[PDB]
Each structure stands twice: as structure tokens, then as C-alpha cells.
Design a protein around this ligand. Structure first.
Ligand SMILES: *C[C@@H](Cn1ccnc1)C(=O)NC[C@@H](NC(=O)[C@H](Cc1nc2ccc(C(C)C)cc2s1)NC(=O)CC)C1CCCCC1
Length: 356
């Protein structure tokens, strides 16, 4: 197979993203690699372990993700060649433009691409300008504007310029924030600068919302990969573009499913690496950010903890506090003491009830 890859992996890592842990679409890993149609994680991990050749426990390296991606490219190419509507266009195209076609197949499948009859004909005819304008009129252009414009530029030019130029813009922007003592990360000063550039306080709710959108691991830490992947997935190539995305992120949090996801993410982001629980003072500081205007008993809860708990907060307790805040009556008369809440919440209700 070595006779038949370098550019296509980085092109789809940018457009689709690379995930090093087993996720849901269906059990997937890497750049959209399907593991099984079975709903069993045990089946999914089994397929992944067999494919890789080690006990991965659903976690892989970038190189392992590449081995899997090359298999999917080779399978995609076989599919295109057996398709009577796609084979002529594929055969006629140069190496760079074939990569843009495989990119479309990865996104919407053979049937999706085969639907672009007029555009595919223009490509086969090497009518690059006419094809570029024609592909931009589709629904494909609206659903994924950043990805589509990059793929369209690949067909228009026959160059990697759309991917090369985004990487240049993000790499130049990165240099403003990188740590002088460590080129592969953004340090304390860099994070402060990033927040200043956004006209936001680093301890503000807006910055915590951005960390959620970037899927950042830990507070006061920001890796180069987090910056690169975050900015690309959000479709931002500048601070101004990221700044303009903040109201959209705010709107999402008005939907309870998104809010629940952001709320639970906060615990994982707030905690110290190597620690399973969140120290009380930290838990209170983040609760004041995320439960502000959502929990009537927030101050009395903080006072209770500082005076009667004075210990770390486990994840389950953090998660369940949101359900408590939502259901609790202003007089606490609906609280099920004989129910299944953490002992800490039963003790809070016992402490709070005589205080009205
Ligand atoms: C720096 C850290 C020191 N420390 C104390 C105990 N363990 C570690 C610290 O001060 N932690 C608590 C702070 N948190 C913050 O100030 C953070 C700073 C940021 N980290 C990141 C990471 C990634 C990003 C990118 C851009 C996605 C951005 C930022 S800003 N801020 C937040 O966590 C947002 C709220 C505070 C304690 C008081 C309550 C607020 C947080």
C-alpha cells in the first residue's frame, strides 16, 4: 500500500477534527473512524484493541489514529472508483483535487457527493472557476461554511493554500500568547494577554464559557493543541472572530441540556490535576459563577459548607446540586428527606429549614 497520504491526514484533522478517546456519533475514534454498529462499548473497545494490537482502553496516540485514517482513505478511494458517477471525475483530477473530493466523501458519503452532478461535471472539465462558484450556492456551504470554503479553494486553485494560510494565521496568533520558558504551551502571562485581548477578566463567566467551548482540560493551563483545535473547530482565526462568537455560546446555555453539560464540565476544569475531588473554596468560587441567578439558597449553601462541611466536594455531589437547585421550593417543603440525595444535601436542608 506504500506505493499508493501526508497532506490528506492534516487536511481532515483540520476539517473534521481528531479525537484520541472513544466518542459517540455510534462508537467512533480518530478522524471519524467507526469502530462498530453494536451499542456495546465492550464490543467497541474489542474492535479498537484488535485494530491497534494493544489494550488501548479506548485511548490512542495520534500515530495510531493515522494508521486508522489511512485505512479509511483507502476504503473511501475503493468506494469512489466503484461509483459510476464519481469514478470519471476522480480519475480526471490531480492529487490535490482528489484529496478535496475524498474530503467531501468523508463528510456526506458517496450519495451526498453524487448529488452535485453539475459541479462534478465542471470539475471533470477543469472549469475550476465555474465549479468553485457553483459549489458555493449549495446547502453544503451553509451547514459547514469554514470547511466548505477551504475545500472549494482546494478545487479552485489545486493548492493547499486554504489549509496552509489558516495554519499560518493561527501560528502567528499563537506566538503572541506562548510561554517564553515553554514554546509548546500558553503560560500565566499568555492566558492573561488572551483575556485582555478579548476585553474580559480571566476569572469571568465569559472566559469559563470559552474554556467549555475549547473543551479545555484545566484552569490556568492552555496547551498549543487546545488553542489550535479550539480556534479551528469554532471557525475562528483571530481574537475578533472569537469575540463575535460569545453571544452564540451564551444563547446555547439558555437550553437546559447545554447548561447541564457546561455545569458538569466546570467541575472537571476547576479541579487540580491528580485530585478526584474539588477543594471547597474552589467549588464555592465556581458555584458563584455558574449558579448565580439559578439557585435561591446559594449563599446559605456556601455558609453551610464553610461552617459544617469544610472538606472537598465529590463530582456526584457537584452534579446533583444542579438537580437540587431546580426542584427545591422556596420553603423547602417539597424536599424528600427519605429520598436519595447526598447526605451533604440532607444536612443542608436540616441546617437551612429553621432559618426559613
Ligand atoms: C491559576 C490557578 C492557581 N491555582 C490555585 C489553586 N490551584 C491552582 C487559579 O488561580 N485557579 C482559580 C482561578 N481560576 C482562574 O483564574 C482561571 C484562569 C484561566 N484559565 C484558563 C485556561 C484556558 C483558557 C482558554 C482561553 C480556553 C482560559 C483560561 S482563564 N479562570 C477560570 O477558570 C474562568 C472562570 C479563579 C478562582 C476564583 C473563581 C474564578 C476562577
Amino acid at each position: 500500500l506504500y506505493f499508493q497520504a501526508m497532506n490528506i491526514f492534516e487536511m481532515l484533522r483540520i476539517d473534521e477534527g481528531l479525537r484520541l478517546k472513544i466518542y459517540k456519533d455510534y462508537y467512533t475514534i480518530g478522524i471519524g473512524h467507526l469502530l462498530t454498529k453494536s451499542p456495546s462499548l465492550n464490543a467497541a473497545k474489542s474492535e479498537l484493541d484488535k485494530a491497534i494490537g494493544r489494550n488501548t482502553n479506548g485511548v490512542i496516540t495520534k500515530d495510531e489514529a493515522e494508521k486508522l485514517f489511512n485505512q479509511d482513505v483507502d476504503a473511501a478511494v475503493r468506494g469512489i472508483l466503484r461509483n459510476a458517477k464519481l469514478k470519471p471525475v476522480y480519475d480526471s483530477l490531480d492529487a490535490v483535487r482528489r484529496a478535496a473530493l475524498i474530503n467531501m466523501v468523508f463528510q456526506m458519503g458517496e450519495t451526498g457527493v453524487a448529488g452535485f452532478t453539475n459541479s462534478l461535471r465542471m470539475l471533470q472539465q477543469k472549469r475550476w472557476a465555474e465549479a468553485a462558484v457553483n459549489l458555493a450556492k449549495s446547502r453544503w456551504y451553509n451547514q459547514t461554511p469554514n470547511r466548505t470554503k477551504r475545500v472549494i479553494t482546494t478545487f479552485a486553485t489545486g493548492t493547499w493554500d486554504a489549509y496552509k494560510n489558516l495554519r499560518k494565521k493561527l501560528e502567528q496568533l499563537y506566538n503572541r500568547y506562548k510561554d517564553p520558558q515553554d514554546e509548546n504551551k500558553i503560560g500565566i502571562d499568555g492566558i492573561q494577554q488572551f483575556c485582555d485581548d478579548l476585553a474580559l477578566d480571566p476569572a469571568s463567566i465569559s472566559v469559563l464559557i470559552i474554556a467549555w467551548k475549547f473543551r479545555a482540560a484545566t484552569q490556568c493551563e492552555f496547551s498549543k493543541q487546545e488553542f489550535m483545535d479550539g480556534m479551528t473547530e469554532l471557525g475562528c482565526d483571530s481574537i475578533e472572530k472569537l469575540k463575535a462568537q460569545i453571544p452564540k455560546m451564551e444563547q446555547e446555555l439558555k437550553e437546559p441540556g447545554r447548561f447541564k453539560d457546561f455545569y458538569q464540565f466546570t467541575f472537571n476544569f476547576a479541579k487540580n490535576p491528580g485530585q478526584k475531588g474539588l477543594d471547597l473554596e474552589m467549588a464555592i468560587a465556581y458555584w458563584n459563577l455558574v449558579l448565580n441567578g439559578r439557585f435561591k439558597f446559594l449563599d446559605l449553601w456556601n455558609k453551610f459548607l464553610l461552617e459544617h462541611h469544610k472538606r472537598s466536594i465529590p463530582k456526584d455531589t457537584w452534579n446533583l446540586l444542579l438537580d437540587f437547585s431546580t426542584m427545591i421550593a422556596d420553603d423547602m417543603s417539597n424536599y424528600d428527606e427519605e429520598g436519595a440525595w447526598p447526605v451533604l444535601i440532607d444536612d443542608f436542608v436540616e441546617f437551612a429549614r429553621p432559618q426559613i
